[PDB]
Design a protein around this ligand. Structure first.
Ligand SMILES: *[C@@H]1O[C@H](CO)[C@@H](O[C@@H]2O[C@H](CO)[C@@H](O)[C@H](O)[C@H]2NC(C)=O)[C@H](O)[C@H]1NC(C)=O
Lengths: 49, 50
């Protein structure tokens, strides 16, 4: 029966913003803009500054 | 004090004294931007604050 059928389980444990990240989602990088008010996405951190 | 029914003390000299009294008149006037303090310039925030 399905209840007794084998199930493969993978558990992913991770921290996101804190610490340097070598693993990232598939977003293309854009040229850095400075001295202007811009929305920024540094390593998954989003803010306007 | 030495007190007597027939005794009085009268000053034969005087002293001029200057003293300083300090009273606060005003306090700093302050204004607060409610959205800037709570939302921190976040576009997503302030929709809830409406
Ligand atoms: C009242 O007090 C003043 C001083 O507080 C006396 O004036 C002094 O007189 C002496 C001489 O006796 C001087 O050496 C001092 O220099 C004086 N002081 C000042 C500030 O001028 C004054 O003589 C006193 N009056 C009485 C009635 O005794």
């Amino acid at each position: 029966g399905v209840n007794y059928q084998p199930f493969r389980v993978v558990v992913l444990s991770f921290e996101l913003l804190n610490g340097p990240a070598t693993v990232c989602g598939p977003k293309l990088s854009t040229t850095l803009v400075k001295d202007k008010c811009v929305n920024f996405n540094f390593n998954g951190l989003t803010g306007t500054g | 004090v030495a007190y007597s029914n027939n005794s009085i003390a009268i000053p034969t000299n005087f002293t001029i004294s200057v003293t300083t009294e300090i009273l606060p008149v005003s306090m700093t006037k302050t204004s607060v931007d409610c959205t800037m303090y709570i939302c921190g310039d976040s576009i997503e925030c302030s929709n809830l604050l409406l």
